[PDB]
Amino acid sequence: AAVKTLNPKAEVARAQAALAVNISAARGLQDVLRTNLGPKGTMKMLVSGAGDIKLTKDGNVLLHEMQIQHPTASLIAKVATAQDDITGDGTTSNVLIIGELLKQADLYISEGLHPRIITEGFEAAKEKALQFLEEVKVSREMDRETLIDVARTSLRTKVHAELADVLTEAVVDSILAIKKQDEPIDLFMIEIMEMKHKSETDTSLIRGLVLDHGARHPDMKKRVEDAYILTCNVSLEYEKTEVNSGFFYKSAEEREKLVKAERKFIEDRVKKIIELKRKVCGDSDKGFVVINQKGIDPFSLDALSKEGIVALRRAKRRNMERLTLACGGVALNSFDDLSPDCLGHAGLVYEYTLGEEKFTFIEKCNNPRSVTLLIKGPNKHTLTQIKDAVRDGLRAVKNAIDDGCVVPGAGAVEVAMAEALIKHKPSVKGRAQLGVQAFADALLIIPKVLAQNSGFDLQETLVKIQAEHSESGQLVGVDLNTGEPMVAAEVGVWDNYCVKKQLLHSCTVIATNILLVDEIMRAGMS
Amino acid sequence: ALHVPKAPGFAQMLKEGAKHFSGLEEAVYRNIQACKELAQTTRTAYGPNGMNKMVINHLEKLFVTNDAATILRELEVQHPAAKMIVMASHMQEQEVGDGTNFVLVFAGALLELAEELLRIGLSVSEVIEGYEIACRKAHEILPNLVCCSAKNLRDIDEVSSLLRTSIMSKQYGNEVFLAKLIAQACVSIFPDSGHFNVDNIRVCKILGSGISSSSVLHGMVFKKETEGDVTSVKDAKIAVYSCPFDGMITETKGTVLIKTAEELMNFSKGEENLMDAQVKAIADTGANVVVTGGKVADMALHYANKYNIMLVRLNSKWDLRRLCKTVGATALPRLTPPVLEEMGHCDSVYLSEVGDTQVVVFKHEKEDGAISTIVLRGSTDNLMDDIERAVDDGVNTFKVLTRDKRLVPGGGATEIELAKQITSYGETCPGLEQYAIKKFAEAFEAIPRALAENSGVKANEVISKLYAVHQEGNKNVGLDIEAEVPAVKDMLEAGILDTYLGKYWAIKLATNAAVTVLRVDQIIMAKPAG
Amino acid sequence: MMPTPVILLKEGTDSSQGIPQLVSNISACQVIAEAVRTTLGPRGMDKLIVDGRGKATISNDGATILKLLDVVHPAAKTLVDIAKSQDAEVGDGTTSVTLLAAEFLKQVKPYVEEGLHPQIIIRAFRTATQLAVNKIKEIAVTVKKADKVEQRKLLEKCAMTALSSKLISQQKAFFAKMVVDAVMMLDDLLQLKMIGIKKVQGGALEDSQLVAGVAFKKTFSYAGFEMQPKKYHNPKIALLNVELELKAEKDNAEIRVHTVEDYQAIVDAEWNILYDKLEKIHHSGAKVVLSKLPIGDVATQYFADRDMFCAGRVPEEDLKRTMMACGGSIQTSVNALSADVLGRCQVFEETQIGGERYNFFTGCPKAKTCTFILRGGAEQFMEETERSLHDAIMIVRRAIKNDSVVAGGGAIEMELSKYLRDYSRTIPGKQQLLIGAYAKALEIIPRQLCDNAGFDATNILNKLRARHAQGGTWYGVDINNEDIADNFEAFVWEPAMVRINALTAASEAACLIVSVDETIKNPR
Ligand SMILES: Nc1ncnc2c1ncn2[C@@H]1O[C@H](COP(=O)(O)OP(=O)(O)O)[C@@H](O)[C@H]1O
Numbered sequence A: 001a002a003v004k005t006l007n008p009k010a011e012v013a014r015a016q017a018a019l020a021v022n023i024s025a026a027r028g029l030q031d032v033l034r035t036n037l038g039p040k041g042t043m044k045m046l047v048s049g050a051g052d053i054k055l056t057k058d059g060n061v062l063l064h065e066m067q068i069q070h071p072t073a074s075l076i077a078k079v080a081t082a083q084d085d086i087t088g089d090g091t092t093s094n095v096l097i098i099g100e101l102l103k104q105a106d107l108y109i110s111e112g113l114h115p116r117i118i119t120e121g122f123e124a125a126k127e128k129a130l131q132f133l134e135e136v137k138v139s140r141e142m143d144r145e146t147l148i149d150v151a152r153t154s155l156r157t158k159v160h161a162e163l164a165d166v167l168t169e170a171v172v173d174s175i176l177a178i179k180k181q182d183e184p185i186d187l188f189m190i191e192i193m194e195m196k197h198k199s200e201t202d203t204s205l206i207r208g209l210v211l212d213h214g215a216r217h218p219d220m221k222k223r224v225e226d227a228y229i230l231t232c233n234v235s236l237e238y239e240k241t242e243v244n245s246g247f248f249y250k251s252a253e254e255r256e257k258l259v260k261a262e263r264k265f266i267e268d269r270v271k272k273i274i275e276l277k278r279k280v281c282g283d284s285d286k287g288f289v290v291i292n293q294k295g296i297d298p299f300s301l302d303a304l305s306k307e308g309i310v311a312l313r314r315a316k317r318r319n320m321e322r323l324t325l326a327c328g329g330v331a332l333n334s335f336d337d338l339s340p341d342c343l344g345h346a347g348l349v350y351e352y353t354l355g356e357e358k359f360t361f362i363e364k365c366n367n368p369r370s371v372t373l374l375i376k377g378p379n380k381h382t383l384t385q386i387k388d389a390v391r392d393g394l395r396a397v398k399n400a401i402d403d404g405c406v407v408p409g410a411g412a413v414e415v416a417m418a419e420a421l422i423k424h425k426p427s428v429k430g431r432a433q434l435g436v437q438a439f440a441d442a443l444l445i446i447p448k449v450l451a452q453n454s455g456f457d458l459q460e461t462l463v464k465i466q467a468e469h470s471e472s473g474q475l476v477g478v479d480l481n482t483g484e485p486m487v488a489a490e491v492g493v494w495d496n497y498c499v500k501k502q503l504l505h506s507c508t509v510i511a512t513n514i515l516l517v518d519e520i521m522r523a524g525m526s
Numbered sequence B: 001a002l003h004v005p006k007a008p009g010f011a012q013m014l015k016e017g018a019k020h021f022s023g024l025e026e027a028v029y030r031n032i033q034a035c036k037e038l039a040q041t042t043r044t045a046y047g048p049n050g051m052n053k054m055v056i057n058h059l060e061k062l063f064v065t066n067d068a069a070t071i072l073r074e075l076e077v078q079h080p081a082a083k084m085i086v087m088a089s090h091m092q093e094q095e096v097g098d099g100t101n102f103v104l105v106f107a108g109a110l111l112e113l114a115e116e117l118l119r120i121g122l123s124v125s126e127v128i129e130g131y132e133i134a135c136r137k138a139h140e141i142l143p144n145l146v147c148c149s150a151k152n153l154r155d156i157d158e159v160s161s162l163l164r165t166s167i168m169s170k171q172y173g174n175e176v177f178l179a180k181l182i183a184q185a186c187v188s189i190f191p192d193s194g195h196f197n198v199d200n201i202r203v204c205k206i207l208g209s210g211i212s213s214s215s216v217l218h219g220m221v222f223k224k225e226t227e228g229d230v231t232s233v234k235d236a237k238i239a240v241y242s243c244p245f246d247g248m249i250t251e252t253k254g255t256v257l258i259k260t261a262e263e264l265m266n267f268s269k270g271e272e273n274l275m276d277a278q279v280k281a282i283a284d285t286g287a288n289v290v291v292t293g294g295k296v297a298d299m300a301l302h303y304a305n306k307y308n309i310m311l312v313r314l315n316s317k318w319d320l321r322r323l324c325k326t327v328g329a330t331a332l333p334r335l336t337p338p339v340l341e342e343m344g345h346c347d348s349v350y351l352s353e354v355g356d357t358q359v360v361v362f363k364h365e366k367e368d369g370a371i372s373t374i375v376l377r378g379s380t381d382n383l384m385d386d387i388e389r390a391v392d393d394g395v396n397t398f399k400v401l402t403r404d405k406r407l408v409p410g411g412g413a414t415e416i417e418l419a420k421q422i423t424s425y426g427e428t429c430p431g432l433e434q435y436a437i438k439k440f441a442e443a444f445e446a447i448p449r450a451l452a453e454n455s456g457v458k459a460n461e462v463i464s465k466l467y468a469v470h471q472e473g474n475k476n477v478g479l480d481i482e483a484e485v486p487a488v489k490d491m492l493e494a495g496i497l498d499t500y501l502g503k504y505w506a507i508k509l510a511t512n513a514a515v516t517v518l519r520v521d522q523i524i525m526a527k528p529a530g
Numbered sequence C: 001m002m003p004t005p006v007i008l009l010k011e012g013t014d015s016s017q018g019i020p021q022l023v024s025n026i027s028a029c030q031v032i033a034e035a036v037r038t039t040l041g042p043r044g045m046d047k048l049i050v051d052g053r054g055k056a057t058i059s060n061d062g063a064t065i066l067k068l069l070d071v072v073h074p075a076a077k078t079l080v081d082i083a084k085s086q087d088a089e090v091g092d093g094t095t096s097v098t099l100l101a102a103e104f105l106k107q108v109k110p111y112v113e114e115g116l117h118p119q120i121i122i123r124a125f126r127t128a129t130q131l132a133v134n135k136i137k138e139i140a141v142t143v144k145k146a147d148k149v150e151q152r153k154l155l156e157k158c159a160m161t162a163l164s165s166k167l168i169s170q171q172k173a174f175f176a177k178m179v180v181d182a183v184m185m186l187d188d189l190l191q192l193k194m195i196g197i198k199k200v201q202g203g204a205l206e207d208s209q210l211v212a213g214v215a216f217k218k219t220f221s222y223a224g225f226e227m228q229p230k231k232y233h234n235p236k237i238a239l240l241n242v243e244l245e246l247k248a249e250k251d252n253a254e255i256r257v258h259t260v261e262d263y264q265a266i267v268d269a270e271w272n273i274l275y276d277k278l279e280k281i282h283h284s285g286a287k288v289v290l291s292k293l294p295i296g297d298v299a300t301q302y303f304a305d306r307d308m309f310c311a312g313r314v315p316e317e318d319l320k321r322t323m324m325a326c327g328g329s330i331q332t333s334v335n336a337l338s339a340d341v342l343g344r345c346q347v348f349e350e351t352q353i354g355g356e357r358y359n360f361f362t363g364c365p366k367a368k369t370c371t372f373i374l375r376g377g378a379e380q381f382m383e384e385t386e387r388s389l390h391d392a393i394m395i396v397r398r399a400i401k402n403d404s405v406v407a408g409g410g411a412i413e414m415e416l417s418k419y420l421r422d423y424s425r426t427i428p429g430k431q432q433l434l435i436g437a438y439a440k441a442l443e444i445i446p447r448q449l450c451d452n453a454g455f456d457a458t459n460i461l462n463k464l465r466a467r468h469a470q471g472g473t474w475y476g477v478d479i480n481n482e483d484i485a486d487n488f489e490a491f492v493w494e495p496a497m498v499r500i501n502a503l504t505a506a507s508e509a510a511c512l513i514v515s516v517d518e519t520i521k522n523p524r
């Protein structure tokens, strides 16, 4: 072709070649991801090049872990990655709707219709679908029951059913705990710690914090009941001078004096801590826990142990905020003027050893605006799966809270939007009615795949559901256990309005751009 | 995302080294580019001022010529569209013998203008329609452009003046001599019947001297020697045998079965007496020259020498047949003496030495016969081969004149008149066909343009002068190569003329080749073997 | 100059086009000329070339040298071809032709570089060639006396000139007399196969000789050949194409007998067949017997007992020469051996010639054939002697057929250069330059003579240009005096056809090379 006359080692896909390539890759991705959809979906096992195992049903994880080197697949993976970064859910449905839009558009483009006209119809249908979505969204007071139904709707798709019944309460309580009225939810304030010793149904919500380290002095207590928490960011180990200094002495006695003196600077901070401890705990009734974002040398650790303080070192820059929000003190970068008001309270602090690692629990706080989810499980891959699931569930509940509206699930909104688009089609001018029809039949891929995965006839189930929705007008979806139509709003199967809107927008746009691609070209080689 | 995959379908099912081109860009334009490159390779050889090329083929053989069809044959053209244009040029060479370079130039021009029209927005179908209607108009016009006719092909001055033009493009410096030679030969072998055979003009290329020492010979020349002792004969009574000059033997295995000392003693003497009887019967028929297509036996040669017979051995069977045509004899498959009709006659048969080469000459004295030979002298084998090609051009022109005696003016005069008239026809023809008609017309301008460029003058000034004179009314005016500046003159009065049939067939074949190249839309090459 | 998915020609096709290609062709021709320049003239040198097999050839002959050079340049092959053509048509001038062609090309090289149209150049070349040829034909000296002594003087002088460039120049009078006797004793056809040239290693050039007869080397004698005599004083000679030995009467012949009497009869019958052939040959009176076919030991001993001479496997050419010399015919049958078919010489002998034995037929008065016997100290010595004698013989033949002589040493070239300068000063001015270049090119022959001799070609050419414009046409280079001289009086004579064909061939080669504007090499 033209490009190969200038760069002989160039690869080129023109007009029909380009479209066939892109649609084929999209349909391949769709064929892989069709099985992820819904609670009746199948778990995939993924083995890295090192031999590491991942068990996932998550569309984004599956995408990034699959072994693919296709440009269209890269485009769609990036669109799904954005969907996940912003909403946390919707990647599988995103890929499926993209693939189905491309297929339904190829159906008409093979018959000589222009992709520009198909994309115009796509744009019209997108507009009408966004309108219908805004119309059908259910504005609801976000109560614990609604949030529980939402988090269940996500976790039951992502993990096993009993583990979903546990993680639902865990996630909803965590969000209802770190949430302040009319103030965007900072999900950073929900720590997620994994422990690898017990069953997966032991995953719980600690109304406090769990640090992945403990005290490094053996004489330090392993359990403290009524603890003053000092969150600090002050080095308690030996610090050398910025300017190169060095010590000069003429006698072993002078060397000894200099050895005792060189630590006075850090001894003073230890003395400040110890004096605060003595001033706030006049006896051994209460406890005192220092948590330092920086180091603590053995001398300081010994000095604090002698006074009965539990010192943890090299905490996390996020744990500074998490501790000041859970306990309720002030995080310090200096001990210039520290006061008892700088301290937090924890009604219990103790340590838990698991093989070679130690954990520190900080619980019984008063009203912690920061909590942690302790992911317990017997395997690293189980823990990873639960981590992904709780990410999905947290994003789901956060979005349901932010957008006080919530949309019915189980393909109900997709069916209804298809019907609305098909009734709207005549109002579209020209052969963009075919693009509208393609958009509608593409939206209809969610109930189709749900039925396919529950083990039902796609056409029969979809005709039943569309008939019920046209006869009654109720937003109805797939019952994955009987294949019958069911009212998602009545049975508690809810999706995120933000997720559906992002689906419509991003899927329409990327499908339009792919359809309008007319030449794939690799010519960067020297 | 670092590799573009082959699209599903034909792109994947295609074999390893196979190629597939489709559409105006990948197929049509690339074919037009290939044919344009071909026309460019052969353009600088067009006309009397055309320069020669020295093509070396894969066999390390050297060809020095400005004959388009020869150059094409000796080039290894590998692009299929160019191959098709070459097929057209070779068909022109076969049908007419001259005009291959016209075919190339015109086809390349038609294809360039077709590319232009496709770029301005016409469809290959419309271009082809317009090209076909314009070729039809050109064929309708040319008979009216015919200016003179031969009026006599038994003369030698008229025939020489007629062949001079065809033998001017090749061998421009020395064309009057060559036209004299070829006219002498053609009118010698031209029979009272209107049929003329080009194979009856033989060409003998002998090393030494130069083209001004070339001559015509009413008879035949063979780079052979005589088998026997006799070398000259003045009243030849030639007897021709397709069989060897030996005793006939059985086609089934023969065995000499001896059973007695007498048979053993007498066998060889009987064999020799038999051979003596055979050759004496041949000599007594009056034959003084015997020509055998097979081998000669020692005893038969002995007795031919005894009875004073000149023996000649022609290895080739075409050589034997042509000698028979020359002398009026019949090849006898048996060694039986020939009857009065089976014998041939020549006013002389002798052995001569032209240069280093020894030759046997069957020479008639009469200025006629069935075969004539042109003995080409020259200082180089390549030069003599080029002069032989020029001779072939002249002889094929003579045959074209025997077929159709009509002549059109050369030096671009007919081309300019055709361009003008077809432009005037396209200006009246409405619809999208007028663009293609006008481009077909402008294509004719490529001929005087190529003539001018090789003459060494400004082709645009030449073409403007020609258009002006043909507008004022002179249809026989073409360009003057004997002018350092752009000039023009009366092609008829100058005697520069082409053959109606030559132009007719050249136009037809060039148009058909271009139209086929355009009709191609997809190309599926296979993996080049090797 | 851009890549294409499918290329017009086969990958590897090298096309050189334009003024650079033409100038490169001219340069290649200059190289080819340089390869032979130093062989020109009496002070010319020989070249030693060696093949892949390691066999060396030593030659002064330009045609030979250029055939041996494995020239592959398509334009430089043309000079080799025209040297071949000159050796064919004339037999001398092979170096001159190449020098002249290359010098024409060199002289027109500047105008080619400055864009002068090759058609114009070739037109000028053709014009000047026709003029020079007609001028040679006009001023060539042709004595119209048909005197035999003057025609032998003429042939001897032309042969001495043709030989005054070889390694036999110190014996050129000797060898010229011999060459002249040879071509004057040939028949009207002047066949080259009728002059035999034997090369017997050993001996001196002056020990070489010409035999007014025929001579050939002894051919694989059997037992009894030494019992045969070796000198005959008036022998009759049987020339045969007959195998004389006990052999299968025929190859497809099968004898079948069922009796021992018939067996013995058959044996004796074979013997009687042979003996009858031998008895016919003996009764024909022939005392010498030559056969193109083998003569067995039985026949050898038969002839030895009859005191006859026999030689078998004699080569066909030597047999034909013996026939043309002694005056008989070659017989495939021995059944009619009449005196008309027998040959005759005054003396037959077998002598020793430098390690080899040679049969001599001498005394044939009706001989239309002669045989050269060349001596020398090396195979290549004798080969270059043979080539020199071939040059001289071809010269003498052409002179016999047309005794029209011009002078050498560059006299004729200087005369033609003067005439062409004169003619060019009378024409418009474009052809003027090219014909003047032709004229200046013609001066390459005396210039190269002076170069190879070790003179100042500039001063000598000034002298010649001056003396040819004052009146005087046969003034050329005098080699032994390092000066000029009237070469027609010095007897440096050259048949006109030599220079006529030299100019014709050189001009044709130049016109061809200059008409080529593109070279296209296909891949092998
Ligand atoms: N219990 C259920 N019954 C029917 N449909 C469900 C149920 N749970 C989830 N779904 C539907 O499955 C779809 C996809 O679920 P999921 O795979 O978790 O999200 P995504 O496909 O976006 O990653 C949702 O749109 C939801 O409507």
Ligand SMILES: Nc1ncnc2c1ncn2[C@@H]1O[C@H](COP(=O)(O)OP(=O)(O)O)[C@@H](O)[C@H]1O
Pocket (backbone or CB within 6 Å): B045, B046, B047, B048, B050, B066, B068, B098, B099, B100, B101, B102, B103, B165, B166, B168, B169, B170, B409, B410, B411, B412, B451, B479, B480, B481, B496, B498
């Ligand atoms: N003396 C001349 N002046 C002008 N044009 C000439 C002359 N002689 C021949 N021509 C032109 O040269 C052309 C022939 O070129 P040539 O190389 O023979 O091409 P082709 O072999 O394909 O016909 C003819 O069209 C003729 O008009």
Ligand SMILES: Nc1ncnc2c1ncn2[C@@H]1O[C@H](COP(=O)(O)OP(=O)(O)O)[C@@H](O)[C@H]1O
Pocket (backbone or CB within 6 Å): C039, C040, C041, C042, C044, C060, C061, C062, C092, C093, C094, C095, C096, C097, C161, C162, C164, C165, C407, C408, C409, C410, C411, C445, C449, C477, C478, C479, C492, C494
């Ligand atoms: N004795 C002589 N004196 C001067 N010039 C001579 C003499 N003999 C030959 N020549 C010149 O030498 C030139 C070339 O000699 P030679 O080498 O024999 O020619 P080629 O090699 O071409 O056959 C001739 O042109 C002739 O004029």
Ligand SMILES: [Mg+2]
Pocket (backbone or CB within 6 Å): A089, A090, A154, A157, A158, A392
């Ligand atoms: Mg989900």
Ligand SMILES: [Mg+2]
Pocket (backbone or CB within 6 Å): B098, B099, B166, B169, B170, B393
């Ligand atoms: Mg022609």
Ligand SMILES: [Mg+2]
Pocket (backbone or CB within 6 Å): C092, C093, C094, C162, C165
């Ligand atoms: Mg010489």
